[PDB]
């Protein structure tokens, strides 16, 4: 009879969490930002077009310098681009062409790529030989890698379709922490600015906040109706936004432990593939399956703009660390810089 | 204009573009096959014949044509999150074991393995990413099926079966029950073969079906189809 008592205590704990969330929900974000001025109409133009990829681009990640970016495509190539001059700085051929995620290290010395091979390949960009070579192959996950972010040159957090996330030491090649609890394929992750916490979104329609040092799940956030494909923190690290297949984006607050806003429109039925915030966090940019990117007002839930330059699904998206530009990658094999 | 180091960086980018173009041409000259089919359907034997965790890639060359075969059977995750990676494959090879007509799933009680194979074939054939992709259907274990059919009847799997309890009629009925699951009959063809286990017959069938797919795609590109 233990199982029934455990599951009733679990449903009582869930009712207590829901009642505490209802208790602290004294107002809404829409009622407080009702008297601030609207952003207006954001019209961004394509400053640059990055051609060279010959298959679908699945992931792009900006560098901390806000000039160099890495892209990953399923033809079998990682390309580091100089976005000011559209020069290809590096072309790295991959051992497995089924890449789904790419990352740029904060220092700029390494890049990583993960995919259906279930391995995270760490490439060293600053060698004495003048070529890029494999520095590490992090093996251990039993599912495809969906997102990888560097914390520093020696530590990387990865998310997988095995329903778990992991923290790795790149020197030894061994998982240092394992984050378990998700019952669905983890599709994305996002590091906090301080890098002490990360959120992960999975296919069980929930997001989880994780403590890097302690290895525990601090908070769980629900509200979506389908697979959470994308997640990203607000710039101060006290909130984050999720994008899902239910054609809505949601803003969640860590301290209030609740959903603050829903960004949706009746004319949108396609799922969100990517989300990022601007430099001040006032604009929320989301990529969709309608071949377009929508710019929303992160405080008023109004659509402020549309980035419509692609012929296929906008798979990925990123905003520079100075906030000067937005890069969008798509399945039509082209990367576009917007401003 | 540009400085000297800027000009040399542009020249390096041009050489990178040239090497990317050459690798893209060499990749476009290859035939991509996605190997699917439920567990213990004969896929391993097929791979062994053709060749002489995560995704496994087999490279072979038959008649100056290079084939890359991608097996994704080890991926135990949600299939709809990575199946769109294989949207532009040249063909799909689906393996079905005939001997499993009267067997049942170990994982799920009272679930016929043929009904699970029909469900998987119906899921990927009418999938939104494989609308134009042709399917090569291999019905494996014909010999085992022939031996089994004399003892055990086909009516365990299909209760609406009314024909003879021999090899040819039951095999044609099973082939009909897989080929009628194709809803988009106009866009895609299903090439059915009964694996012989002999020397090069299977790869020859694959070669012929891929040649037919390349013809149909050239016809579509040339506007004639």
């Amino acid at each position: 009879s233990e199982l029934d008592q455990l599951r009733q205590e679990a449903e009582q704990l869930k009712n207590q969490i829901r009642d505490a969330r209802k208790a602290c929900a004294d107002a809404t974000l829409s009622q407080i930002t009702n008297n601030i001025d609207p952003v207006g109409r954001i019209q961004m133009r394509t400053r640059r077009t990055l051609r060279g990829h010959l298959a679908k681009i699945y992931a792009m990640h900006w560098g901390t310098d806000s000039r160099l970016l890495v892209s990953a495509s399923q033809d079998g190539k990682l390309i580091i681009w100089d976005s000011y001059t559209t020069n290809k700085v590096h072309a790295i051929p991959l051992r497995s062409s089924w890449v789904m995620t790419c990352a740029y290290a904060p220092s700029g010395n390494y890049v990583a790529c993960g995919g259906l091979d279930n391995i995270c390949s760490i490439y060293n960009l600053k060698t004495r030989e003048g070529n890029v070579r494999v520095s590490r192959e992090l093996a251990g996950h039993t599912g495809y890698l969906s997102c990888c972010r560097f914390l520093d040159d020696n530590q990387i957090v990865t998310s997988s379709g095995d329903t778990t996330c992991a923290l790795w030491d790149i020197e030894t090649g061994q998982q240092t922490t394992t984050f378990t609890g998700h019952t669905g394929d983890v599709m994305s992750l996002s590091l906090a600015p301080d890098t002490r916490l990360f959120v992960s979104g999975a296919c069980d329609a929930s997001a989880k906040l994780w403590d890097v040092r302690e290895g525990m799940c601090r908070q769980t956030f629900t509200g979506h109706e389908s697979d959470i494909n994308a997640i990203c923190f607000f710039p101060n690290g006290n909130a984050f936004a999720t994008g899902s297949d239910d054609a809505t984006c949601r803003l969640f607050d860590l301290r209030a432990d609740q959903e603050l806003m829903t960004y949706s429109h009746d004319n949108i039925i396609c799922g969100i593939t990517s989300v990022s915030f601007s430099k001040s966090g006032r604009l929320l940019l989301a990529g969709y399956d309608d071949f377009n990117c929508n710019v929303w007002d992160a405080l008023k839930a109004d659509r402020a703009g549309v980035l419509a330059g692609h012929d296929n699904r906008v798979s990925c998206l990123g905003v520079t660390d100075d906030g000067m530009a937005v890069a969008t990658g798509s399945w039509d094999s082209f990367l576009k810089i917007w401003n | 204009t540009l400085s000297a180091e800027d000009k040399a960086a542009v020249e390096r980018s041009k050489m990178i573009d040239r090497n990317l173009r050459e690798d893209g041409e060499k990749a476009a000259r290859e035939v991509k096959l996605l190997l699917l089919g439920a567990g213990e359907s004969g896929k391993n034997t097929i791979v062994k014949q053709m060749k002489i965790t995560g995704i496994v890639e087999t490279h072979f060359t038959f008649k100056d044509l290079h084939f890359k075969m991608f097996d994704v059977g080890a991926q135990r995750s949600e299939r709809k999150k990575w199946i769109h990676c294989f949207e532009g494959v040249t063909a799909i090879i689906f393996c079905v074991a005939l001997s499993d007509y009267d067997l049942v799933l170990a994982e799920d009680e009272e679930m016929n393995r043929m009904h699970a194979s029909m469900k998987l074939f119906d899921s990927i054939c009418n999938n939104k990413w494989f609308t134009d992709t042709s399917i090569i259907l291999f019905l494996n274990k014909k010999d085992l099926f022939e031996e089994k059919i004399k003892k055990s009847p086909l009516t365990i799997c299909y209760p609406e079966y009314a024909g003879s309890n021999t090899y040819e009629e039951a095999a044609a009925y099973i082939q009909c029950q897989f080929e009628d699951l194709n809803k988009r009959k106009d866009t895609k063809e299903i090439y059915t073969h009964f694996t012989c286990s002999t020397d090069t017959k299977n790869v020859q069938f694959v070669f012929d079906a891929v040649t037919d797919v390349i013809i149909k795609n050239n016809l579509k590109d040339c506007g004639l189809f």
Epitope: R67, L68, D82, N87, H90, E129 | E5
Partner: single-chain antibody, 235 residues
Framework: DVQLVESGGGLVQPGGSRKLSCSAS????????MHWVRQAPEKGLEWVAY????????YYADTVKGRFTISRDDPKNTLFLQMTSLRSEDTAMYYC??????????????WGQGTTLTVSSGSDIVMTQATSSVPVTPGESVSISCRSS???????????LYWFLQRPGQSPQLLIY???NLASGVPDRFSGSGSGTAFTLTISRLEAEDVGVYYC?????????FGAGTKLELK
């Protein structure tokens, strides 16, 4: 391990011909542009020739133009310099130098050991190192200065000046690239500054391994020109 080895030197008669070779090992040779730099037996460094990665771009100094021919064999990892109609002024030690060019790269970062050639008997940028010898004592901080006839600050934000150190009996070593960036494997005591036309290299806490000749070089436009060199000696 990166190695550039030069062969083919020796005594030649005027009007003759010789072919110098440079064997490369330990790096991806075909992705690097290669240079030939000469050093007269008592003078400073002079740039001779340059071939790009992929052999698409070839430059020559005016003194050697029409006589010298630079080439490369990328499957054999060899750089060649075919010199014809030699003159007495071509007696010098010849160095092959590797330089790769991309955003954030450090060109001129490895120099070969050099091969000795003995020949028996207007709008170029001028780099000026006014003092030719500074006596120094270990522990102190020293500043070496270079000036340019043309502003080396480009419109892209880069200032194309490079600092090199040649120890006694060795090949030159890259110290600073693009005015302020410190080269890989160089200690943090070296620092470069300047403003378009006037530049300074500061060595804090001078050690005994810092004596030798210091050369400034511009990489704004071809031909590349060196400074006369400032010598640091003890006492």
């Amino acid at each position: 391990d990166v190695q550039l080895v030069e062969s083919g030197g020796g005594l030649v008669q005027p009007g003759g011909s010789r072919k110098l070779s440079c064997s490369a090992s330990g790096f991806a040779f075909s992705s690097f542009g290669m240079h030939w730099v000469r050093q007269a037996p008592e003078k400073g460094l002079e740039w001779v020739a340059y071939i790009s990665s992929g052999s698409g771009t070839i430059y020559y100094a005016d003194t050697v133009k029409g006589r010298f021919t630079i080439s490369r064999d990328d499957p054999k990892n060899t750089l060649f310099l075919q010199m014809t109609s030699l003159r007495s002024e071509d007696t010098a030690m010849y160095y092959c130098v590797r330089s790769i060019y991309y955003y954030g790269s450090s060109p001129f970062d490895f120099w070969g050991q050099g091969t000795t050639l003995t020949v028996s008997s207007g709008s170029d940028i001028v780099m000026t190192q006014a003092t030719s010898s500074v006596p120094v004592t270990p522990g102190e901080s020293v500043s070496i200065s270079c000036r340019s006839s043309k502003s080396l600050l480009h419109s892209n934000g880069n200032t194309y000046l490079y600092w090199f150190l040649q120890r006694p009996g060795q090949s030159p070593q890259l110290l600073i690239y693009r005015m302020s960036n410190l080269a890989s494997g160089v200690p943090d005591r070296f620092s470069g500054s300047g403003s378009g036309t006037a530049f300074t290299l500061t060595i804090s806490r001078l050690e005994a391994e810092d004596v030798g000749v210091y050369y400034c070089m511009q990489h704004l436009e071809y031909p590349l020109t060196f400074g006369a060199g400032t010598k640091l000696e003890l006492k």
